[PDB]
């Protein structure tokens, strides 16, 4: 009895493992992941910076981060509003970080932004153009967060 | 050693479970669902009033209830069209009472309603532009089930 | 009592296995599954028919089956584009079959298809106004799978 339990139930875990990872995809194919993209994902909710990495965070994803153009266009479409990206310069000054760690290898920066504007702007939006600009990470806009391709 | 598979097993039936929940939350934030608010979804489906109890009880849910001007709103953009809401005069004539228990506090009456018109209207339905109209439980409206912020 | 553990790890399965269900019959609901009826998903992806059947087969569905024109208007909503659909004359020039087996019955051709046109077509895409028309299984079109009732 026992043992023979004991190894079915290893095969009841192994299967609903298999079942849950087939739901995860079902899922993330009904979200519009695209084969081997990265996804962006948004409940279309304005918040400030901090909820934004600690929702993303609860997800386990991370603040939507464009590492190229096409998916600068695949963020601006998805959010459709001003949105948060996962960059800041909240460390240095006038140095724009990955929240995920690094510094910038793409960038899409409005003329004459980041501009760390007024009371200072350290966190950054991608505006309805695909454009970037520094904003307060005070400031509420959309939520958007990046599972792996 | 079957103890300690025994201990390897609920560790990896902990971790399934936690696995689970996440994706329960990620759903609910790609279907739209706002930070700490109420979760509505809807099928698009037009179906007596018994039936769409009967769907969201099955989900583990229940009849979409606006308890606030704000949750009418969220309600009105999922459902698009017509749809039953969680609330019924079906004991006292006049008393409208939450499926779910309680006189009912939030309302948003069109003009000239409720009017338990013809042979009688003892359900709810949100209409054009979020105002409500008491209707037939037997008529199909659009199923919208809400689920715990 | 290692007894007591197993039995509660017999529950704990159980409960997941229900749960799991819930969640799954939650995102069929959210994705527009109608009572009794099958349902239709897509990531909006242009592919190959080969790459939509393996991918539509992975997530336990199959490459959309319109079987009568309600089913046929469902997925042309769905897809929004052109979109293969599992019926193709592969085996057999000139006889449509079902992916899933047995000879074609509904269909909604446009005029004058099919046709195997050029070298040939032997995969069928829904495509303006939700007509029909026979094109190569190379082309890509968008993946639409379908789910049983
Ligand atoms: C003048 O500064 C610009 O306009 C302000 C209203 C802010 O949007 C600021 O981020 C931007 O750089
Ligand atoms: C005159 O009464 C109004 O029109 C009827 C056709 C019904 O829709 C009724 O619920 C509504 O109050
Ligand atoms: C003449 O053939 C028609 O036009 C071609 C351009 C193709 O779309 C073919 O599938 C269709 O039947
Ligand atoms: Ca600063
Ligand atoms: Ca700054
Ligand atoms: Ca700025
Ligand atoms: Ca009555
Ligand atoms: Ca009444
Ligand atoms: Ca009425
Ligand atoms: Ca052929
Ligand atoms: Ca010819
Ligand atoms: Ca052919
Ligand atoms: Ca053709
Ligand atoms: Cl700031
Ligand atoms: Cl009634
Ligand atoms: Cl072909």
Redesign the pocket.
Known sequence: AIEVKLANMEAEINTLKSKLELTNKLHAFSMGKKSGKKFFVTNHERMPFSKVKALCSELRGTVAIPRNAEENKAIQEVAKTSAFLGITDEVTEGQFMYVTGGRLTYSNW?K????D??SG?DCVTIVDNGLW????CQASHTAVCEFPA
């Open positions: 409005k004459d932004e980041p501009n504007h007024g702007e600009n520094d904003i307060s």
